[PDB]
Homo-oligomer: A and B are copies of this chain.
Amino acid sequence: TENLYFQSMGLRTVEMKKGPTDSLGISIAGGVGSPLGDVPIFIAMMHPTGVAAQTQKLRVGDRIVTICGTSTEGMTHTQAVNLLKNASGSIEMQVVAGGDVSETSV
């Protein structure tokens, strides 16, 4: 009754437990200092078998706005990876539509 309001604005909030594989099954790109330059952090790819796909609220090309309650504003690529790698229990992510990458089924 609060996620629903933000989704209408539309920021999407997702809760994820990591697998028995200790993985979210997503690849993130961007961030300050990333191999792409200082660009926002987004989801580049999603593993077929993995946890994030089962959310069905996470999409390739979503920008990551917050991770485990922390804004990604000014966050480096390496910090975002460290945060998600070390996180455990329920992992909160909030995202918005980006077109940093758009994907098409074929």
Give the B-binding residues of A (Cβ under 8 A): 23-24, 26-30, 34-36, 39, 42-49, 53, 60-61, 77, 81, 84-85, 99-106
Query: In the complex the two chains form, is B24's CB within 8 Å of A102's CB?
Result: no
Interface core residue of A28, A46, A101, A102 (most chain B CB under 10 Å): A101
- A14 CA to B34 CA, complexed, in Å: 27
Interface of A is mostly: mixed
Q: Which residues of B sit under 8 angstroms from A81, Cβ to Cβ? A: 104, 106
Q: Which residues of B sit under 8 angstroms from A99, Cβ to Cβ? A: 35
Q: List 13 A-B contacts (CB under 8 A).
A: A27-B60, A28-B103, A29-B44, A29-B101, A34-B102, A36-B39, A36-B100, A44-B102, A45-B61, A47-B105, A77-B102, A77-B104, A85-B106
